[PDB]
């Protein structure tokens, strides 16, 4: 999870346990480059994935003619001109919560009234 690469070797840094000082390290098995550890975290699976629903957001998203138009105002700039679209994460259990994209400050504010 967000691992680093070696210098010159550019290979991934496998975790190495430091038994002398009893502390985590990051090694490269090709060479002798071992750096310290700034965090004890190593691996995170994250089963239930909720990211990717708002995928593919570009600076030129406001010039898409296929996308719809709404009249709801933004909570920030208070602009009623925005473009909404549902989640980009395609899955069976994906909710139909709309995603509002303002055409002024480019803020992404949703329409969920239960959890915000």
């Amino acid at each position: 999870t967000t691992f680093r690469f070696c210098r010159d070797c550019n290979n991934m840094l496998y975790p190495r346990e430091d038994k002398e000082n009893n502390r985590l390290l990051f090694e490269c098995r090709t060479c002798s480059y071992v750096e310290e550890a700034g965090s004890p975290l190593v691996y995170r699976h994250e089963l239930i994935t909720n990211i990717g629903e708002t995928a593919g957001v570009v600076q030129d998203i406001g010039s898409d003619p296929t996308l719809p138009r709404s009249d709801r105002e933004c909570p920030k700039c208070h602009s009623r001109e925005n473009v909404f679209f549902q989640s980009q994460q395609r899955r069976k259990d994906t909710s139909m919560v709309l995603f509002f994209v303002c055409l002024s400050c480019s803020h992404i504010f949703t329409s969920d009234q239960k959890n915000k």
Binding site: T66, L67, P68, F84, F85, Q86, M96
Partner: protein
Amino acid sequence: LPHFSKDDYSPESKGFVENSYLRGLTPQEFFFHAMGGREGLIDTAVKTAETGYIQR
């Protein structure tokens, strides 16, 4: 169809034919009705083709 907007869940755009055969149908409804007709023909053909084998 490329004649409606994206992420449209309105019943009219999803296949509801609110017109009747007395006043005619719109193109986006006649297309879906043609899909249902072809599906009916194919389904009947398969049901007969299997019905014969079952009969034998």
